[PDB]
Design a protein around this ligand. Structure first.
Ligand SMILES: *[C@@H]1O[C@H](CO)[C@@H](O[C@@H]2O[C@H](CO)[C@@H](O)[C@H](O)[C@H]2NC(C)=O)[C@H](O)[C@H]1NC(C)=O
Ligand SMILES: *[C@@H]1O[C@H](CO)[C@@H](O[C@@H]2O[C@H](CO)[C@@H](O)[C@H](O)[C@H]2NC(C)=O)[C@H](O)[C@H]1NC(C)=O
Ligand SMILES: *[C@@H]1O[C@H](CO)[C@@H](O[C@@H]2O[C@H](CO)[C@@H](O)[C@H](O)[C@H]2NC(C)=O)[C@H](O)[C@H]1NC(C)=O
Ligand SMILES: *[C@@H]1O[C@H](CO)[C@@H](O[C@@H]2O[C@H](CO)[C@@H](O)[C@H](O)[C@H]2NC(C)=O)[C@H](O)[C@H]1NC(C)=O
Ligand SMILES: *[C@@H]1O[C@H](CO)[C@@H](O[C@@H]2O[C@H](CO)[C@@H](O)[C@H](O)[C@H]2NC(C)=O)[C@H](O)[C@H]1NC(C)=O
Ligand SMILES: *[C@@H]1O[C@H](CO)[C@@H](O[C@@H]2O[C@H](CO)[C@@H](O)[C@H](O)[C@H]2NC(C)=O)[C@H](O)[C@H]1NC(C)=O
Ligand SMILES: *[C@@H]1O[C@H](CO)[C@@H](O)[C@H](O)[C@H]1NC(C)=O
Lengths: 86, 169, 193, 50, 50
């Protein structure tokens, strides 16, 4: 199969679009489905038209409480090398 | 360094692993270039589309909305921007094409024209565009009647000021 | 019972120290990689020429290690400054910056310590189960235009209410939740009620 | 004649000047040549790698 | 005699390649901060009112 990233051997080119799994490049990704290795154009997401008009409004009637995590590196290992003994 | 000659290539082995380090460094900076784009543009879950009949209270977004007869389905102003700007060396392509990034910006732009700031906090909830403009006027400390009584003037000023970006570029 | 952004730092630093250790076994164009085997079977005038190539190679190894540590410490400092700013603005206050403290309307945050980092637990409010309604900018009554004080005018199909904009809680339109400004002939979309 | 290299030679659409014997581009790599018997100029392209 | 002359080229070319790779790390660390600011402006000016 000929991509714009190069020539790809050993993967079948399907026609459906999934989320990206292993990036090949120039818009192509690969994944292990079903049992074989397939290559496809990635999808950006599901489509959605909003019911816009000039006198319509959507107002929520309930809510959820969400808790999510965020991880950040603060520090690293302090190392010294004696330049002469090295 | 050697250019396919076994004499130079054997002498090079005496230098250890300098050339595995250099490749590791360049690979580490070529992966983060795609990470850079993913975090600016993939800020939506859905790809939102704008309605076919576009009446936004007098505001006119036609020079920044996608144009089907154009290359890569870009907006009119995204085109002016794309027109203004061997031996062991290769260039790798980016993971997202330019078509994909123009798709991402048109989904952001249709989300904001149509739902205000609600789609960045949850599900998109539609609201008429002038009522959204009135909420934004409230957010800077002006009352809403000042928008509703000056709607046509505010819309004309906005249209005429979007028309000047296009000239200056 | 995830942490790859912390394991990446550990792995990159171990991978650099391993390369520095392993470059101690290259000749760099000398006869031996071990200095004692040049010293034992050579005399000073010719030991010196072989020792100088080892010195040259090992100095360059060490300099590459130190430059790449300096570039990586500057990336760790930006991360720690961002984590300090999140600790001040997300744990010691409530933020209005969108997406700064999680997805949704920030309510609060809790810190937790990690091996070389920090984990923030962000509590946010996410609205749910939206319904459709008809809206109007203003109400017209007695030849006057009425605007909501804080909310929106909504119709369930037959009746008009005021509600707050994030939670549906309909109330009667009175002179206590509205204010007046002008006639009902200038604003585009007034309804009569 | 002494110009030594390796690659794949194709026929070209350049036009040298009668005294000019080979061409080179920016970065000064040889990308054309004249062969000394046909008097025809040939494009030089590196042999695929990756 | 060609070993001594090939090593002089090897040393120079290694130096030049490693200078290229250092200056790219320093330039990428600057592009990274610009993209981090662009990601914050997309959140705070496009999906909100600042
Ligand atoms: C929004 O503004 C654009 C101007 O950029 C209007 O489109 C052009 O209008 C002129 C004047 O009639 C025409 O000559 C062009 O053919 C129009 N199309 C272009 C330039 O692509 C557009 O009509 C405006 N929208 C509304 C609803 O008025
Ligand atoms: C508000 O009303 C609109 C328009 O009536 C609804 O939009 C529908 O969206 C679906 C998408 O699955 C379309 O197939 C329908 O044609 C649309 N119109 C309908 C059902 O009349 C929208 O779903 C409504 N919103 C809510 C929250 O109920
Ligand atoms: C819109 O809401 C109004 C008021 O909530 C509804 O009118 C009331 O409906 C109840 C139904 O049991 C009656 O008992 C009341 O007498 C009605 N009038 C009042 C309270 O003043 C109306 O039915 C709703 N309309 C729709 C289409 O749902
Ligand atoms: C909002 O849009 C609706 C429909 O696009 C407008 O209703 C039209 O109003 C004009 C004049 O008021 C009529 O000539 C059309 O026949 C109406 N359309 C339909 C389908 O009935 C409405 O005027 C717009 N403005 C608002 C509600 O303020
Ligand atoms: C809302 O009610 C007002 C009256 O309170 C209506 O105003 C009348 O409009 C007609 C037609 O435009 C005029 O001929 C009358 O002179 C108006 N009377 C007054 C007292 O202003 C208005 O038309 C109504 N509008 C709707 C949409 O119901
Ligand atoms: C080099 O010599 C050969 C002959 O030894 C020439 O070849 C002739 O070229 C002409 C074109 O000008 C042809 O019409 C003849 O058929 C060729 N003959 C043979 C036997 O090959 C060639 O032209 C000479 N070139 C130079 C530059 O001297
Ligand atoms: C993919 O879809 C295109 C539709 O244009 C079709 O021409 C092509 O044969 C399809 N390929 C496969 C493997 O189904």
């Amino acid at each position: 199969f000929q991509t714009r990233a190069g020539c790809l051997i050993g993967a079948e080119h399907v026609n459906n679009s999934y989320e990206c799994d292993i990036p090949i490049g120039a818009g192509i990704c690969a994944s292990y489905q079903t049992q074989s290795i397939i290559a496809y154009t990635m999808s950006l997401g599901a489509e959605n038209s909003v019911a816009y008009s000039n006198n319509s409004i959507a107002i929520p009637t309930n809510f959820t409480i969400s808790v999510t995590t965020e991880i950040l590196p603060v520090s690293m290992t302090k190392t010294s090398v004696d330049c002469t003994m090295y | 360094i050697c250019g396919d000659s076994t004499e130079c290539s054997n002498l090079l082995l005496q230098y250890g692993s300098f050339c595995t380090q250099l490749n590791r460094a360049l690979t580490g900076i070529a992966v983060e270039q795609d990470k850079n784009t993913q975090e600016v543009f993939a800020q939506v879950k859905q790809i939102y589309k704008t309605p076919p009949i576009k009446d936004f209270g007098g505001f006119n977004f036609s020079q920044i909305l996608p144009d089907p007869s154009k290359p890569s389905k870009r907006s009119f102003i995204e085109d002016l921007l794309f027109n203004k700007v061997f031996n062991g060396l290769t260039v790798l392509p980016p993971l997202l094409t330019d078509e994909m990034i123009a798709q991402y910006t048109s989904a952001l732009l249709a989300g904001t024209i149509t739902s205000g700031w609600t789609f960045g906090a949850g599900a998109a909830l539609q609201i008429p565009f002038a009522m959204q403009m009135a909420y934004r006027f409230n957010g800077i400390g002006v009352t809403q009647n000042v928008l509703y009584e000056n709607q046509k003037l505010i819309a004309n000023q906005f249209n005429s000021a979007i028309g000047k970006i296009q000239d200056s570029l | 019972s995830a942490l790859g952004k912390l394991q990446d730092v550990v792995n990159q630093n171990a991978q650099a120290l391993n390369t520095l250790v392993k470059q101690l076994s290259s000749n760099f164009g000398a006869i031996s990689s071990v200095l004692n085997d040049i010293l034992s079977r050579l005399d000073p005038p010719e030991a010196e020429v072989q020792i100088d190539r080892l010195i040259t190679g090992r100095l360059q190894s060490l300099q590459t290690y130190v430059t790449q540590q300096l570039i990586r410490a500057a990336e760790i400092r930006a991360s720690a400054n961002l984590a300090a700013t999140k600790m001040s603005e997300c744990v010691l206050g409530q933020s209005k910056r969108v997406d700064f403290c999680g997805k949704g309307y920030h309510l609060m945050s809790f810190p937790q310590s990690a091996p070389h980092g920090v984990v923030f637990l962000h509590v946010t409010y996410v609205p749910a189960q939206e319904k459709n309604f008809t809206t109007a900018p203003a109400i017209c009554h007695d030849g006057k235009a009425h605007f909501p004080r804080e909310g929106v005018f909504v119709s369930n199909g037959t009746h008009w209410f005021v509600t707050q904009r994030n939670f549906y809680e309909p109330q009667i339109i009175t002179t206590d939740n509205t204010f007046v400004s002008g006639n009902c002939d200038v604003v585009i979309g007034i309804v009569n009620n | 004649n002494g110009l030594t290299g390796t690659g794949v030679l194709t026929e070209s659409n350049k036009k040298f000047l009668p005294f000019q014997q080979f061409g080179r581009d920016i970065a000064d790599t040889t990308d054309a040549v004249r062969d000394p018997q046909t008097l025809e100029i040939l494009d030089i392209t590196p042999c695929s790698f990756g």
